DNA sequence: GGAGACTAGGGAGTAATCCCCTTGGCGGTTAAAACGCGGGGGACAGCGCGTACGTGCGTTTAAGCGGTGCTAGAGCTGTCTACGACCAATT
DNA sequence: ATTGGTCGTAGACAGCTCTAGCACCGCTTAAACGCACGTACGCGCTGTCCCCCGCGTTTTAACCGCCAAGGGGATTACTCCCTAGTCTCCAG
């Protein structure tokens, strides 16, 4: 379920919107749907990195492993 | 962009099954959060302008799911 | 809320048969 | 009759796509199987209670499917369970969770959502319909493909096997019916104009039509005049004899009870057959001799219906919807009619 | 047959992959990976060519398989 | 750059499994050769990545199954 | 004179797919011109690759390498 | 997806323009079909990209001349 | 044939180098290769932007043009 | 760091780039363009140098890189 | 003889790849064409001065090529100029900038750098050598290709046409020579082991070998026994009669003067002798038919690798091109090489 | 720089041809 | 307005982290052989091609007028004119 | 040391943008039409088989040195586990 506060997400969304172009209204249903998809994707890559670290035979995590996962995805 | 609170990151991590987490996790998590946020909003507005609309809609994010293959 | 309307065994006329 | 709606989520609040009763059942207790987005096929135990209301008992869970499942089919003998869906793998489950099932043969060859499966009367032949625009004939004993019918140009959402084993009736999303002769392995008939069927605007993923248990008549849902259900005959498949008007939403399912009932007329034979038609939000119950429907149930599900199924004896009529909830129709002793 | 994935051929393909040091069990787990993914890709490829009513697979089927597997090239 | 004919009859035998009497044109043959070589070079590269990641120079299968689980293989 | 084979409504609905609403009729001729010149470009490399396999018949694989040369692989 | 017979006429005419005594594969022909389709549609999104920067909806050839000069194939 | 002040360029590329990997020794040849790539790509880009601005009918050039060209390029 | 390129240098290179009337903010997006371009080139140079086990970056490395993205 | 070095950049300091004299010339003034990285083909006017030193006069610039040009060839009659290079397009220039040239036919079909072109004696059939592992036979009058030779497995850097019009000699980077009969259009002979030639490490982009003007013998440079230049014969093309030792840098160019000289160890036995020029990376050796040892040798005249050499119509000029952007000429006095037949 | 060494027409022995 | 949460902050302690064998499985070496490359009919049986067929929804002309390209006049602003100071730079 | 390179200031106006103005040629049917599409099918024919022989480069086995994966232990370092204000999200 939801574990991220609505207002910080909405205010960063408005921040990037006003960076791009003003007068772009955001509806509550679309905002919450995009937020839940956001949480789903981020947690998905999160346990992706968790399994990566599990192979890394070191229970503590360090983000360079996450960046390996990034170039596995080829996002950047 | 600061709005993604680090304790929220840590409790979502606890849900993710991790045990000990390096501090510098937060900044790169936020960065790759916003890159996909940007990709999805770009696809959303791409469909929206063809729809001649100005407001985000769940159909846009559904098509984003379809395009990126996360459906 | 929904208001259920149930019609028992009557041996509905709005759904009468139409032929060609 | 009585109608009981299942208010507990069968597949964890996900839409239900198919239902099927065990054709091998011969007593009072019938075995029902369900398909959902949870990639699991749940076989339930359905039997009348002391008061006559339907009672559902969970038996087994079938999680072998990697993706969503759209259609679940029992063999006419009830031995083998057919299951395919989003992963597009047709599993032939066999009785090896109160009970257990195991897949016999992997009838792979489809690409995505497989919507309609029809068992041949012998049970050794399969008709497979999926979004992939094709119909594939398989051998159950061999477990291998033997014939291909890919003339479909849109979502193949409905198929049934001729009980006489002569033709193959297919319904695709392109508002076109295709009849395939079983011996020629080619198209027997093509009817598209009296359009006759509903376009893509119809919201049901299925166009499941079924032959009459004797095969003499074919009932096709999702038609247009307005939404209606046309009736065809073996004598002429290029012109419908009559249509059953269903104002409101479009019909999506046609299922016929496998029990022949005495006459208390679309076709003229000494026996009558009671069949069930499921629309998006309403169900109309007809019989062979009476043109008008003798039963009608509506406003019982909050979303679009997906599948219906008759019991082996005709005492149960399961109804599945897309809201994650199902329902049943219970008739008393020979309420529909006098069995032959 | 299946052992056709030749051991020094695996070595040279690893060379082109920038691999440093190679052990024996790789020389057949590579056979496993090759056989399973080719099973998959020729599966959807033969399906695609069955859509074309064609009895022979095509490079078109292969490239669509790569799109479906996310390795378009 | 796998050797041509051993790979081609690998493909032939594994194609016969679905159903016999299958003919494959050389065009599609080099096409599927391209596909296999592209996949193997990509996976090998990512194995090298996760191997130097594993802080061992020599390659280990555990890297391979890792890559599979991340690449959605199982 | 088959160049005129690419018609007004076809180009108009490609435009519809393109992301335009209003396009003038004076663009159809330049559209056929750009089409013909770049099919010339691509088929030159295509026929070269075809000759490379001692082939008197073109293959679908050729256009692949043609787009790789042109930098628009698909 | 655009049309078949006129494009086959185009490819055959340009083929005889290159050299006679040649044959094409049906699959290769349709492959060339979607290849040209993709190339032209991509050019046309470029066209839309320029026209929007041209802050005009309707398009005049100078847009597509940019498309080509800017990427410089000719 | 260069105009960018060569040692400021060398210090720029060096400071970029130690941002990723420390103690990277660069010779004159590597610096001039980086240069030639620099002026080549920038002069091509400005050729592009100027002709696009001519299409724009506007004498002045503003970065909507360069953003236009790069959204052509596929770099993002 | 990125300020190694000066605004007058930007202006003169633009001038021989064929432009006459220029706005200010170009002086900053050009730096972003330059870094975006050079990161890929230097990354490929690092890869080639590690392939050849040469710590120092050579001219031919950069030349073959420019051949790879196609602006030799 | 005298050697004059061109210290002025012909193509704006870019490396020069080829040189060719107008075979249609019949007097004292000869027309020379050059190819460089600047995508231009410059035809010059070369003539002896009052002191006998060569004088170079610019005539025309040919910038139709979009990319660099590696080989430039004149017709045996001098009418049509062949030019191809990085853009992989073969142009048939013709006399329609002191003068002007126009391309007649576009002999396309090649892919990348075209390194060697040879004109057939009749002038109606073309041999083209390019990196693309093939040699294509063309029709000059038709302007269309007619035959394909794809047996090359590496960079094809040298080809020549048999003056007798029977075979085709090709040299590729794979240290393998391929002989194609002009009648069968198949491989007649193939020699790879005596390696037989030099590998890819040799730094010249060209492996230009040429037949003897009578076609009796074939002179193949860039050989290994040390660098050498093997000689074959029509009687047996699978075994060298002799090789010319050139220790140091590898030979890369072989050109034969089109003037038959009278006889003054012998490589071949006919009443006439032929003087040919061999250019290595930094040295040029001048031999004749009858003498095993060279009667001329010029070196240390160019700062970088030599690219191409060319004889004049009368043999009085021997142009030399290098990769440093500078060229040079060798001037012989009246019948200095020998008395023509 | 380079030091030019030129040998005139002598009717050297380091390049004497050896037969087989 | 008021109540969960987070942000700021000690404790150490468990978790990385680098050193030290350490041996055993792995990197080149050798001999040949064993499949790897190839080419040649054989025409048999697989393959596409052209055209006929028809017939029907896409293709073609046009009204037509008005949403959209085209022109005038701002008009108000950010260069680039000159420059006076700093100011990094080659040796 | 000096020396050319740079930087930042002052405003005239050139020109990007905004508004007003204008006409004219993309939508939008209605009707003519045509070739697009679908199968046969005879005719062409291209890809081919596949064996062996030719013949030859690479594969495989085994050796032997030796590099490294992993174990051990000392070493530091970083979230507990509250402690506490806070602050603001959300309900009333």
Q: What span, in angstroms and rounded, lies between the C-alpha atoms of K72 and K90?
A: 9
Report strand pairing: D30-36 vs D177-181. unpaired
Domain membership of residue D40 as a residue range: 2-330
Q: What span, in angstroms and rounded, lies between the C-alpha atoms of D266 and D241?
A: 8
Cβ atoms within 10 Å of C13's Cβ, excluding its own: 6
User: Any idea what DSSP says for residue D204?
Assistant: -
User: Any idea what DSSP says for residue D333?
Assistant: T
Token pair of B21 as six digits: 């987490």
Q: Which residues of chain H are within 8 Å of residue I71 when distances are taken between CB atoms?
A: 49
Q: What span, in angstroms and rounded, lies between the C-alpha atoms of D312 and D320?
A: 18
- Whether residue A71 contacts residue A48, with contact meaning beta carbons closer than 8 Å, is answered with no
**Beta strands of chain I (E only): which ranges?**
60-61
Instruction: Measure CA K80 to chain center.
Output: 16
- Mention every residue, 6+ apart, whose C-beta is less than 8 A from residue K90: K82, K83, K84, K106, K107, K108, K110, K114, K117, K126, K128, K138
- Does the beta-carbon distance from L15 to K246 stay under 8 Å? yes
- Give CA torsion, residues I38, I43, I44, I49, to 10 deg: 130
In a domain, D115, yes or no: yes
In a domain, K336, yes or no: no
CB-based contact (8 Å) between F56 and chain A? Answer: no
A62 touches strand M (CB under 7 A): yes
Q: What are phi and psi of K312, to 5 degrees?
A: -80, 175
F3 touches strand N (CB under 7 A): yes
Q: How far is G17 from chain E (nearest CA, A)?
A: 21
Q: Which residue has the tokens 């609403």?
A: G21
- Mention every residue, 6+ apart, whose C-beta is less than 8 A from residue C7: D296
Domain membership of residue E29 as a residue range: 1-73
User: Any idea what DSSP says for residue I63?
Assistant: T
- Mention every residue, 6+ apart, whose C-beta is less than 8 A from residue F23: E55, E56
User: Any idea what DSSP says for residue K81?
Assistant: E
Q: What span, in angstroms and rounded, lies between the C-alpha atoms of I52 and I38?
A: 21
- Closest among K141, K152, K150 to K175, alpha carbons compared: K152
Q: What span, in angstroms and rounded, lies between the C-alpha atoms of H49 and G21?
A: 13
Q: Does residue F70 sit in helix, strand or coil? A: helix
A19 CA to M79 C1' in angstroms comes to 26
Q: What span, in angstroms and rounded, lies between the C-alpha atoms of A29 and A43?
A: 21
Q: What span, in angstroms and rounded, lies between the C-alpha atoms of H36 and K176?
A: 40
Query: Please, what's the largest Cα pairwise distance for chain I?
Result: 49
Top residue of G61, G65, G68, G72 to mutate, by most chain E CBs within 10 Å, is G61
Report strand pairing: J21-22 vs I60-61. parallel
In a domain, D206, yes or no: yes
Q: Does residue C4 sit in helix, strand or coil? A: coil
Cβ atoms within 10 Å of F17's Cβ, excluding its own: 10
- Whether residue E51 contacts residue D133, with contact meaning beta carbons closer than 8 Å, is answered with yes
Q: Which residues pair with D233 in a beta bridge?
A: D217
Q: What are phi and psi of K224, to 5 degrees?
A: -130, 135
Q: How far is F44 from chain E (nearest CA, A)?
A: 5
3-state secondary structure B14-48: HHCCCCCECCCHHHHHHHHHHHHHHHHHHHHHHHH
Q: What span, in angstroms and rounded, lies between the C-alpha atoms of I35 and J59?
A: 11
Q: Does residue I20 sit in helix, strand or coil? A: helix
Q: Does residue K221 sit in helix, strand or coil? A: strand
Report strand pairing: K135-139 vs D91-95. unpaired
Q: How far is H63 from chain I (nearest CA, A)?
A: 8
Q: Does residue B3 sit in helix, strand or coil? A: coil
Q: What span, in angstroms and rounded, lies between the C-alpha atoms of K171 and K156?
A: 6
User: What Rg do the C-alpha atoms of chain K give, in angstroms?
Assistant: 18
Domain count, chain D: 1
Sign, CA torsion A49/A54/A55/A58: positive
Q: Which residues of chain D are within 8 Å of residue E49 when distances are taken between CB atoms?
A: none
- Whether residue B19 contacts residue B36, with contact meaning beta carbons closer than 8 Å, is answered with no
Q: What span, in angstroms and rounded, lies between the C-alpha atoms of K242 and K233?
A: 10
Q: Do chains I and J touch (3 or more CB pairs under 8 A)?
A: yes
- Mention every residue, 6+ apart, whose C-beta is less than 8 A from residue I36: I2
Q: Which residue has the tokens 């378009």?
A: E72
Q: What span, in angstroms and rounded, lies between the C-alpha atoms of D318 and D329?
A: 6
I7 touches strand M (CB under 7 A): yes
The CATH number covering residue B71 comes to 1.10.20.10
- Does the beta-carbon distance from K246 to L11 stay under 8 Å? no
Q: What is the DSSP string of K154-181?
A: S-EEEEEE-TTSSEEEEEETTS-EEEEE
Token pair of B10 as six digits: 């840590």
Q: Does residue K141 sit in helix, strand or coil? A: coil
Q: What span, in angstroms and rounded, lies between the C-alpha atoms of K2 and J63?
A: 40
Per CATH, the number for F1-74 is: 1.10.20.10
Residue nearest to nucleotide N59 (CA to C1'): E8
The alpha-helical segments, DSSP class H, found in G2-59 are 8-18, 27-52
The technique by which this structure was obtained is: cryo-EM
What's the angle, vertex CA K114, arms to CA K191 and CA K6, rounded to 5? 105
Q: Which residue of H has its CA nearest to I71?
A: H49
Residue D170's alpha-carbon distances to D115, D177, D258, D310, H8, in angstroms, are 12, 6, 21, 21, 34
Token pair of D316 as six digits: 């149960």
Report strand pairing: K101-107 vs D41-48. unpaired
- Whether residue D40 contacts residue D329, with contact meaning beta carbons closer than 8 Å, is answered with no
User: Any idea what DSSP says for residue D339?
Assistant: B
- Mention every residue, 6+ apart, whose C-beta is less than 8 A from residue G5: H3, H5, H6, H7, H9, H10
Name the strand (E) or helix (H) holding K202: none
Task: Answer left, alpha or beta for residue B69, where phi above 0 means left and psi between -120 and 50 means alpha.
Answer: left
Cβ atoms within 10 Å of A16's Cβ, excluding its own: 14
Q: What span, in angstroms and rounded, lies between the C-alpha atoms of K259 and F12?
A: 62
- Whether residue D189 contacts residue D180, with contact meaning beta carbons closer than 8 Å, is answered with no
Domain count, chain G: 1
Q: Which residue of H has its CA nearest to I45?
A: H70
Q: What are phi and psi of G16, to 5 degrees?
A: -55, -45
- Closest among H2, H56, H51 to H30, alpha carbons compared: H2
Q: How far is D276 from chain C (nearest CA, A)?
A: 16
Token pair of K99 as six digits: 């003068």
Counting Cα atoms < 13 Å in the Cβ hemisphere of E20 gives 15
Q: Which residues pair with J47 in a beta bridge?
A: none
Task: Answer left, alpha or beta for residue F42, where phi above 0 means left and psi between -120 and 50 means alpha.
Answer: alpha
- Closest among D89, D67, D74, D94 to D31, alpha carbons compared: D74
Q: What are phi and psi of I55, to 5 degrees?
A: -60, -30
Chain B residues 1 to 40 with C-beta below 7 Å from nucleic strand M: 5-8, 11, 19-20
Q: What are phi and psi of D68, to 5 degrees?
A: -65, 155
Q: What span, in angstroms and rounded, lies between the C-alpha atoms of K264 and K285?
A: 19
Describe the strand order of the beta sheet including D41-48 as a list of residue ranges.
Answer: D16-21, D30-36, D41-48, D54-62
- Whether residue D297 contacts residue D329, with contact meaning beta carbons closer than 8 Å, is answered with yes
Q: Which of residues 37-56 of H touch G (CB under 8 A)?
A: 38-45, 47-48, 51
- CATH class of the structural domain I1-76: mainly alpha
Q: What are phi and psi of E18, to 5 degrees?
A: 75, 20
Is residue K67 classed exposed, middle or buried when 0-12, 13-18 and 19+ CB atoms within 10 A define those classes? middle
Inter-axis angle of helices F4-16 and F26-53, nearest 10 = 100
Q: What are phi and psi of D46, to 5 degrees?
A: -115, 125
Token pair of A20 as six digits: 């791009």
Token pair of D162 as six digits: 């001729």
Q: How far is G46 from chain F (nearest CA, A)?
A: 14
- Does the beta-carbon distance from I34 to J66 stay under 8 Å? no
- Does the beta-carbon distance from F30 to G61 stay under 8 Å? yes
Q: What span, in angstroms and rounded, lies between the C-alpha atoms of D321 and D280?
A: 9
- Mention every residue, 6+ apart, whose C-beta is less than 8 A from residue K249: K227, K280, K281, K282, K283
Give resolution, Å, one decimal.
Answer: 5.6
Across the interface, of K242, K298, K303, the residue whose CB is closest to L17 is K242
Q: Which residues of chain G are within 8 Å of residue H26 when distances are taken between CB atoms?
A: none
Q: Which residues pair with D85 in a beta bridge?
A: D69
Nucleotide lying nearest to I57, CA to C1' measure? N16
Q: Which residue of D has its CA nearest to C3?
A: D299
| Chains touching E (3+ CB pairs < 8 Å) | D, F, G, H
Q: What span, in angstroms and rounded, lies between the C-alpha atoms of G15 and G3?
A: 19
Q: What span, in angstroms and rounded, lies between the C-alpha atoms of B3 and A16?
A: 12
Q: How far is E22 from chain G (nearest CA, A)?
A: 33
Q: What span, in angstroms and rounded, lies between the C-alpha atoms of K314 and A55?
A: 79
- Give CA torsion, residues K65, K67, K72, K74, to 10 deg: -10
User: Any idea what DSSP says for residue K14?
Assistant: P
- Whether residue K159 contacts residue K170, with contact meaning beta carbons closer than 8 Å, is answered with yes
Sign, CA torsion D249/D251/D257/D262: positive
Cβ atoms within 10 Å of D50's Cβ, excluding its own: 6
Q: What span, in angstroms and rounded, lies between the C-alpha atoms of K158 and K170?
A: 6
In a domain, K338, yes or no: no
Chain G residues 10 to 69 with C-beta below 7 Å from nucleic strand N: 12, 21-26, 55-57
A56 CA to M9 C1' in angstroms comes to 32
- Whether residue D218 contacts residue D211, with contact meaning beta carbons closer than 8 Å, is answered with yes
Chain H residues 31 to 70 with C-beta below 7 Å from nucleic strand M: 56-58, 60
E39 CA to N47 C1' in angstroms comes to 26
Q: What are phi and psi of D111, to 5 degrees?
A: -110, -45
Q: What is the DSSP string of K90-101?
A: EEEEEE---S-E
Q: What span, in angstroms and rounded, lies between the C-alpha atoms of A43 and A48?
A: 8
Chain M: nucleotides under 7 Å from a protein CB?
5-7, 15-17, 25-27, 35-37, 46-50, 58-61, 68-70, 78-80, 88-90
The CATH number covering residue K104 comes to 2.130.10.10
Q: What are phi and psi of H5, to 5 degrees?
A: -65, -50
Q: Which residue has the tokens 């999680």?
A: D63
């Amino acid at each position: 379920e939801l574990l991220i506060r609505k207002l910080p997400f909405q205010r960063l969304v408005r921040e990037i919107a006003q960076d791009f172009k003003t007068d772009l209204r955001f509806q509550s249903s679309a905002v919450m749907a995009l937020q839940e998809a956001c949480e789903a994707y981020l947690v998905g890559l999160f346990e992706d990195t968790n399994l990566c670290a599990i192979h890394a035979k070191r229970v503590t995590i360090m983000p360079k492993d996450i960046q390996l996962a990034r170039r596995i995805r080829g996002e950047r | 962009i600061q709005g993604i609170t680090k304790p929220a990151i840590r409790r979502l991590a606890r849900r993710g099954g991790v045990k000990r987490i390096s501090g510098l996790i937060y900044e790169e998590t936020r960065g790759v959060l916003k890159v996909f946020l940007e990709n999805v909003i770009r696809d959303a507005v791409t469909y929206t302008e063809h729809a001649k609309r100005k407001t985000v809609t769940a159909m846009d994010v559904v098509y984003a799911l379809k395009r990126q293959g996360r459906t | 809320v929904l208001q259920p309307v149930k019609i028992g065994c009557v041996w509905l006329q709005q759904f009468a048969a139409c032929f060609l | 009759m009585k109608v009981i709606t299942c208010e507990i989520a069968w597949h964890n609040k996900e839409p239900v796509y198919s239902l099927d009763f065990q054709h091998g059942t011969a007593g009072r207790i019938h075995r029902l199987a369900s398909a959902g987005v949870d990639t699991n096929v749940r076989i339930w135990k359905v039997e009348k209670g002391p008061d006559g209301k339907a009672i559902v008992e969970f038996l087994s869970n079938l999680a072998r499917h990697t993706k969503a499942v759209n259609v679940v089919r029992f063999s006419p003998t009830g031995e083998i369970l057919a299951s395919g869906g989003d992963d597009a793998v047709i599993l032939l489950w066999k009785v090896n969770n109160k009970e257990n099932w195991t897949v016999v043969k992997t009838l792979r060859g489809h690409l995505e959502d497989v919507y309609d499966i029809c068992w041949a009367t012998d049970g050794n032949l399969m008709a497979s319909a999926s979004v992939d625009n094709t119909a594939i004939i398989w051998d159950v004993s061999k477990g291998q493909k033997i014939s291909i019918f890919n003339e479909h140009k849109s979502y193949v959402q409905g198929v049934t096997w001729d009980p006489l084993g002569q033709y193959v009736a297919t319904l695709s999303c392109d508002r076109v019916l295709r009849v395939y002769s079983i011996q020629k392995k080619r198209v027997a008939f093509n009817v598209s104009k009296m359009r006759m069927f509903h376009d893509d605007s119809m919201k049901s993923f299925f166009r499941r039509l079924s032959f009459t248990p004797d095969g003499s008549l074919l009932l096709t849902p999702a038609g247009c005049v307005m939404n209606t259900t046309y009736v065809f005959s073996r004598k002429n498949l290029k012109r419908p004899i009559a249509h059953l008007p269903c104002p409101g939403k479009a019909t999506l399912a046609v299922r016929c009870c496998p029990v022949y009932f005495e006459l208390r007329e679309l076709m003229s034979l000494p026996y009558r057959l009671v069949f069930a038609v499921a629309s998006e939000d309403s169900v109309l119950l007809y019989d062979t001799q009476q043109s008008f429907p003798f039963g009608y149930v509506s406003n019982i599900h909050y979303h679009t219906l997906s599948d219906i199924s008759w019991s082996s004896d005709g005492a149960f009529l399961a109804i599945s919807s897309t809201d994650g909830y199902c329902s049943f129709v219970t008739f008393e002793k020979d309420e529909l009619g006098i069995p032959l």
